[PDB]
């Protein structure tokens, strides 16, 4: 398993809208992702990785 | 309660070494903080807020 320690804190870009679940690109890799609070994070938006649920990244939109 | 949504994703600076518990400054406020994985994050280091445990911020050191 690619651990939590490797992913948490990284920035990615939404490639498939998080509504609240979707798809993000982090480094070169595609990942399943879920926004922590927001109902919807749009394609192209920058997100921050804050946790991990199995192979699903939990993200908030990047601040400012 | 100042919710998780307000704090998660923000950057702060360690004001009292996280070993793993300590003190950080986020915005103008002093907060209790705990590093998520690391055994020790030093004074002056930049951290990212990834979660919250009561009034204690859970942080990783800022990437790159
Ligand atoms: Na949600
Ligand atoms: Na620990």
Swiss-Prot record, chains A, B:
Subcellular location, record wording: Membrane
Subunit structure: Homodimer.
Similarity remark: Belongs to the peptidase S14 family.
Function, in words: Protease that cleaves its substrates preferentially near hydrophobic or aromatic amino acid residues. Can degrade casein and the stomatin homolog PH1511 (in vitro).
UniProt-recorded name of the protein: Membrane-bound protease PH1510
Native source organism of the sequence: Pyrococcus horikoshii (strain ATCC 700860 / DSM 12428 / JCM 9974 / NBRC 100139 / OT-3)
Stretch of the intact protein here: 373 to 436 of 441
């Amino acid at each position: 398993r690619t651990g939590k320690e490797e992913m948490i804190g990284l920035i990615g870009t939404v490639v498939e809208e998080l509504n609240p679940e979707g798809m993000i690109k982090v480094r070169g890799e595609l990942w399943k992702a879920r926004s922590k609070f927001n109902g919807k994070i749009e394609k192209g938006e920058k997100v921050r990785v804050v946790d991990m649920d199995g192979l699903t990244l939990i993200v908030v939109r990047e601040r400012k």
